[PDB]
């Protein structure tokens, strides 16, 4: 898993 993935709704 990527700690810098988008953490907000609807990427």
């Amino acid at each position: 898993a990527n700690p810098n993935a988008n953490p907000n709704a609807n990427p």
Partner: antibody
Amino acid sequence: QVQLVESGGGVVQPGRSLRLSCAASGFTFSIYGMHWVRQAPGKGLEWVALIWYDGTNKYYTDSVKGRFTISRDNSKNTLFLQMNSVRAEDTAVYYCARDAHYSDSSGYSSWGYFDYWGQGSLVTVSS
Amino acid sequence: EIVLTQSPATLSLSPGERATLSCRASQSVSSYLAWYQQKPGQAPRLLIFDASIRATGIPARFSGSGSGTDFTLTISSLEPEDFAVYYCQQRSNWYTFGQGTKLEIKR
């Protein structure tokens, strides 16, 4: 309208626990990732932890991993930092911050910056 | 772990003058860089993100440039409300900040 109001700070003895709260108003809390960032007295900014909009994924900086827990209650528009096993080096002003989600008319999308911040809550770890 | 190094440590200027602040990363961060302003006792404020995009509500005198490892924040005409500490931050690999540059009033 965007507001983040923190509460829960104060003095805590080493080894004990303290829970911080960040009450959000003025935006759709449940669509935003949320972070905690801290600033020790006289020093710079250090990212602490992040939680996804839906409470699933959570990430922590190495020095707090296994001691602090991030959580949120979307129905109450509140973000939490549960600080356990605290140490003197955790003394700092703790800020909550919203993930600066950004998009344009052409499908560009950004995140991973801190666009609105709480007022800060001082946590003093001392005996 | 990416280390961001800011220079100079202090800049001493007068209103009206151009201020140039530098941030150097230990390895490339592409364009995933932001700049913040912070005044004593207050929370930081996001100025610039993705190296060069101005945040909503930020005056046009603030601009950011650079990519890779070398970045610059320019304030084209300093105004009194700009005296503060400035930090850079990257989100290419985890989340780290520079150590700050203080922009102080010369006299």
